[PDB]
Amino acid sequence: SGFRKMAFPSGKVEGCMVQVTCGTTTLNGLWLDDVVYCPRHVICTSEDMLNPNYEDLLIRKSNHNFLVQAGNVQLRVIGHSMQNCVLKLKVDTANPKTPKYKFVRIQPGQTFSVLACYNGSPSGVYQCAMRPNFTIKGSFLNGSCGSVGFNIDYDCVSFCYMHHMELPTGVHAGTDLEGNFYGPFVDRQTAQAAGTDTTITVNVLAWLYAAVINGDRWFLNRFTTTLNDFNLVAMKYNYEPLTQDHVDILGPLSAQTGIAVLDMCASLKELLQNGMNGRTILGSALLEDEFTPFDVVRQCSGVTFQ
Amino acid sequence: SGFRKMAFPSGKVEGCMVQVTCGTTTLNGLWLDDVVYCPRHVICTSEDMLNPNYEDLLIRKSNHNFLVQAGNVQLRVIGHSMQNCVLKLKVDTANPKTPKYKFVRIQPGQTFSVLACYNGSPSGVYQCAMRPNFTIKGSFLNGSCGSVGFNIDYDCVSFCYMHHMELPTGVHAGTDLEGNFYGPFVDRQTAQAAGTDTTITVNVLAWLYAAVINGDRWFLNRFTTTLNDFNLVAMKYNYEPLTQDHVDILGPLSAQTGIAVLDMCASLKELLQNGMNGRTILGSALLEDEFTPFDVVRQCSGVTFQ
Secondary structure: OOOOOOEOOOHHHHOOEEEEEEOOEEEEEEEEOOEEEEEHHHHOOOOHHHOOOHHHHHHHOOHHHOEEEEOOEEEOEEEEEEEOOEEEEEEOOOOOOOOOEEEOOOOOOOEEEEEEEEOOEEEEEEEEEOOOOOOEOOOOOOOOOOOEEEEEEOOEEEEEEEEEEEOOOOOEEEEOOOOOEOOOOOOOOOOOOOOOOOEOHHHHHHHHHHHHHOOOOOOOOOOOOOHHHHHHHHHHOOEOOOOHHHHHHOHHHHHHHOOOHHHHHHHHHHHHHHOOOOOOEOOEOOOOOOOOHHHHHHHHHOOOOO | OOOOOOEOOOHHHHOOEEEEEEOOEEEEEEEEOOEEEEEHHHHOOOOHHHOOOHHHHHHHOOHHHOEEEEOOEEEOEEEEEEEOOEEEEEEOOOOOOOOOEEEOOOOOOOEEEEEEEEOOEEEEEEEEEOOOOOOEOOOOOOOOOOOEEEEEEOOEEEEEEEEEEEOOOOOEEEEOOOOOEOOOOOOOOOOOOOOOOOEOHHHHHHHHHHHHHOOOOOOOOOOOOOHHHHHHHHHHOOEOOOOHHHHHHOHHHHHHHOOOHHHHHHHHHHHHHHOOOOOOEOOEOOOOOOOOHHHHHHHHHOOOOO
16 A cells, blocks of 8 residues: 655666767766767856757767766767757767666656656656646756656666756756757756646646545535546646546546545536645655656556566 | 656666566565575465565575576576565576675655666656655555665765565565664564654755745745744644754755745745745755755756766
């Protein structure tokens, strides 16, 4: 029993992190077989970041201007290429720790693990969600750019995120591994607005089912409701609307607990309109939205990986 | 900026996890150089667990009754020994992934990372604290016994915990790596009471400093107080008393923020006697006690490891 915000084991990712230096700035890169991926603003100083012309800056640099280091071993850059916001540095050695991997673009509301790194060396791992406004609420200090987010299918590592920027509001923004930003952001030190953030309703419902599985049942109410009527209430409290696709996804949890999805929505509706009144659920005084329905099934059934 | 409950990178531990089978029961073991460590109740069936005589049971077993497997490779047991609640299985091969390691016994209120495993295979990693009543509030399913807790000094892995039992109340109990239980517990399926749990006051104070560092300052109050007067209030709300040793430990955080330790205690005292009144701190509606002062300095300064 019990429920924790669990991250994926990081071993397959640790062996791929390198340090990349181009001038004064140093950040992290990802070393898969014979290519190193890192944010393109590694070629910028602090002055350039205010208004950078990346094509013009890249032309000023050469292969020998990039120093790639893994622990105490140096890598020689044999070629360089810019793919939209990522730099691809081709080196002479294939990484002998390269895992079975995949590049994927995730959707908002999905979760993943972040390996926070400094100077190419890992500091810690934590689990987070992609917000509906395409930001992440992370923990990044100076020099952590290039840290990656990932999921693990049993033997395959799916890389989904590379960290680039801290916005002036203190939230974080980045790209997929093809270098396309999540959200409307650009890699420039200018004021940038993120949209209104909303709570991920299908994730809250999955977490309520996890609460039931673990014995927290006081919130199971006396009512039911319709999907159209639930969404009306949810729109008032900045919750995202529920679709039939979300109901289908919650099917397995409904069958395990004996509680229909629309019945659980009735309990949630009452939670929103009246609060939790000084009581808790799974140790929390707030409603939690960074577990997906798949996260709950994984943790409650103990799936393992390579 | 930002603050997350961060676990240590797990790579050095993943390479040490094995599966141990003795009859029907299968659980996890820890493979360091030529020894495998696992809970001794691996030799028990469900019937034996109600009233086991471990010495008598162990004599019935032989070296060939233990099957040790790492992935798809089998290990041959060359000898067996019981050290108090752990079994030490000597095998014929030294683990070539053995890291620099140490065995340590931690004190209540200290934190560590848990690598949750099933059938010798890792499922996830999370950070937790040892409660003052020597339990842990974890996430363990059937077959997770033998999972270990650890900290990482830069190049050294300090193993501090092995999971053994889920108590009938749903909290978890285990031993250090010499097989001595934390707390008053025994490895028998009988009702066992854990003491009153208390909140770890020095950890709450460290987390308030982290809140200030990240810009949450609304709780900084108008008062000060004395250590004797603070402890009187803290004893009423089931907080552990503060000592001068705890004040000395908080020194660096006080110097970074300009806020004396006793002044922060005055803010905490007011938080306890009046609540947080529907507001949050670092995203939480409850006071958090699973970050140590060292955890806060590590995360706010970005120390890295091997």
